[PDB]
């Protein structure tokens, strides 16, 4: 298909006039700006969807992960590539969308905040394997799925294409941030149209995610902390 540039802006280094912390940042730029492949997901007849919180999915893999957990401040953009292919006799559709500041809501009917339910840490920050949607219809947050087209997004329609690519810059209210404490955005994949085929067709359809962290900056060097 095409390539989506989120908000029509390329990622870039934090410039003059926009920085606050005063020390020279590091830019590895070849060993961190590369493509990483995650383990895939089995798309089945009743799968609800998956999500990944992004400045933690790569937080433990490679030179990027080592830089992230050695430095205290981080900033970069991303390139997202979701792959899923089937035969010409399969049918379905997936919505792939990038949600900045994707805050997961607790699921319960307690009106007193003291004893109200809350998601556990892993559900909020799944890591490399992601999490599955409990209620895809309300985006697991109380807001409708239908309007998630306001976010930068693509469709994988099995009769049209088999890849979805989004290029996204750095979105935050501060020029630099901690990559262990804050997840800048989440990536959601949801099958709004179910997967269908006939007997004799392959039943094992995988969905794979590959990401590239463009324009990586780290600062505030100290010992290595990851939690």
């Amino acid at each position: 298909a095409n390539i989506v540039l989120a908000y029509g802006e390329w990622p870039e280094y934090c410039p003059d006039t926009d920085a606050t912390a005063v020390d020279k940042p590091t830019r590895p730029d070849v060993s961190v700006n590369r493509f990483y492949t995650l383990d895939s997901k089995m798309w089945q007849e009743n799968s609800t969807g998956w999500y990944w919180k992004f400045p933690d999915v790569l937080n433990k893999t490679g030179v990027f992960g080592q830089n992230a957990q050695f430095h205290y401040l981080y900033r970069s953009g991303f390139c997202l590539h979701v792959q899923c292919n089937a035969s010409k006799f399969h049918q379905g559709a997936l919505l792939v969308a990038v949600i900045p500041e994707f805050v997961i809501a607790g699921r319960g009917s307690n009106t007193k905040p003291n004893e109200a339910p809350h998601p556990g840490f892993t559900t909020t920050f799944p890591g490399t394997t992601g999490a599955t949607f409990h209620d895809p219809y309300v985006l697991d947050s109380g807001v409708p799925l239908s309007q998630a087209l306001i976010y930068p997004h693509q469709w994988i329609n099995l009769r049209t294409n088999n890849c979805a690519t989004v290029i996204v810059p750095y979105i935050n209210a501060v020029p630099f941030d901690s990559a262990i404490n804050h997840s800048n955005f989440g990536l959601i994949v949801i099958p709004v149209s179910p997967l269908k085929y006939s007997s004799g067709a392959t039943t094992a359809i995988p969905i794979t995610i590959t990401i590239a962290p463009l324009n990586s900056e780290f600062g505030g060097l100290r010992q290595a902390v990851s939690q």
């Binding site: 805050v103 319960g108 009106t111 556990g120 840490f121 807001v143 804050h182 955005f185």
Partner: protein, 226 residues
Amino acid sequence: VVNRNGVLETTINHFFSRSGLVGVVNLTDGTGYATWDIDIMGFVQLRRKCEMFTYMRFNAEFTFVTTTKNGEARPYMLQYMYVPPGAPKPTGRDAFQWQTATNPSVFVKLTDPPAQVSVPFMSPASAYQWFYDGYPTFGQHPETSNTTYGLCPNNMMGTFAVRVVSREASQLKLQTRVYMKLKHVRAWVPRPIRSQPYLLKNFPNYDSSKITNSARDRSSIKQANM
């Protein structure tokens, strides 16, 4: 067709520049003072409008409208104090905090027009954000009673205290309503407008056992009733 219809009403500034109910503070004067934590997601009408965006930067105007239980307007003097983060909180109707020497305050009568002040953008960050995906601390973040997952410490702006300036107890049950208007507004990253009912002031929780449909049900897909 040479259309001249007008689109100026649809701008962000005209959409957000109207006072709305933000807080209600109840005083008994039987303690002698009342306090309120400044946080404006307590009422749904302004919350739904403000949560259509991720980042928002603006100045504000605060109006205070104080009445009694029966609604009378007897002439008394009230002190409104704004206590920024860190500053000591008043402890009595006559404590040493009420001789505000660096803190801002407004002395106003119950018979006066509602009080009105201007407030700037006061965040250590570059914008107020209602959605903060993360924790404000390095730690263990337990998996049972989590909390602190949506603190956004860049949004904590102090408290508001109100007292009756008097020699002794005045035996007045007062109720002051705080109305906020947004001015000189900028916004970033629009989001879906909430469909589920609100449950908590500081969390996005919703009743999963009772999910409301975003469209009202109709009998068949071949009719046009609903």
